[PDB]
């Protein structure tokens, strides 16, 4: 649902 930050330069939308 909400954003998920993995690391520097990696995300999920």
């Amino acid at each position, epitope marked *: 649902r*909400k*954003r*998920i*930050h*993995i*690391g*520097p*330069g*990696r*995300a*999920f939308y």
Partner: antibody, heavy 131, light 109 residues
Framework: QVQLVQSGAEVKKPGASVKVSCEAS????????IHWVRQAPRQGLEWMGW????????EYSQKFQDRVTMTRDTSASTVYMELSSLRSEDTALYYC????????????????????????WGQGTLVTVSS | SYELTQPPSVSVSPGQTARITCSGD??????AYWYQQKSGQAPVLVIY???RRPSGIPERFSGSSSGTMATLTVSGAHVDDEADYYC???????????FGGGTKLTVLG
């Protein structure tokens, strides 16, 4: 079996530098980034930055961007964190913590929400800045 | 900018509900995470992704998030729930993680 073991405590002089090491074991070192958060005595937690295990790309806090540099050893499965221009106010307990989410997106895969992979911290390293 | 703010202290009687509310403008689109830190111990994550518990945390700990507010709730507080509670979320503008100032939970009586 996931473990993050940090280097031992040490005294350092004002103006010198520290480099704490954070050695990982029990998981694929490449698929996880590693945080660094510190806590001065009787103060709150403050995030310093994190760095991925594979590419070594770093991202620093606005408070520490001048003095902190973070690196990692691809072969040794260890991330490092260095703070120069040490003052007495940098006397703190320095933790490393594995990121909550592994890297599922870089691989060839149509959307898959990366799962929460647990709360895992190092034991911390006390850095005393004194003469 | 951006900041997460939580009260410094919250007092609760044994058996009733304690509520720690973290306020942040990015909470509508950013998850909130809650850490428990007892005296002389490392932080322990008790709530991940606004409302989920890491496996091993008692279910009397619960979390929610609505608008600019994220709340950690301890239903029927034990004396053993006295600790410092930190909220933790993403600062997208500055591209950094941020902690709340922390809230000391005092169990009265």
């Amino acid at each position: 079996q996931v473990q993050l073991v940090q280097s031992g405590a040490e005294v350092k002089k004002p103006g010198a530098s520290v480099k704490v090491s954070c050695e990982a074991s029990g998981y694929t070192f490449a698929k996880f980034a590693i945080h660094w958060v510190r806590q001065a005595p009787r103060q709150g937690l403050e995030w310093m930055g994190w760095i991925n295990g594979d590419d070594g790309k770093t991202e620093y806090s606005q408070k520490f961007q001048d003095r902190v540099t973070m690196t990692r050893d691809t072969s040794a499965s260890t991330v490092y964190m260095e703070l120069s221009s040490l003052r007495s106010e940098d006397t703190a307990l320095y933790y490393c913590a594995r990121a909550m989410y592994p890297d599922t997106v870089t691989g060839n895969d149509n959307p898959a929400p990366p799962p929460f992979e647990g709360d895992y911290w190092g034991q911390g390293t006390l850095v005393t800045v004194s003469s | 900018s951006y900041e997460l703010t939580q009260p410094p202290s919250v007092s609760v009687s044994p058996g009733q509900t304690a509520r720690i509310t973290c306020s942040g403008d990015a909470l509508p689109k950013e998850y909130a995470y809650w850490y428990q830190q007892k005296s002389g111990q490392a932080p322990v994550l008790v709530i991940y992704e606004d409302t989920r518990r890491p496996s091993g945390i008692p279910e009397r700990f619960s979390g929610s998030s609505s608008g600019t507010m994220a709340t950690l709730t301890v239903s029927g507080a034990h004396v053993d729930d006295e600790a410092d509670y930190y909220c933790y979320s993403r600062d997208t503008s500055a591209n950094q993680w941020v902690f709340g100032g922390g809230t000391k939970l005092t169990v009265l009586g």
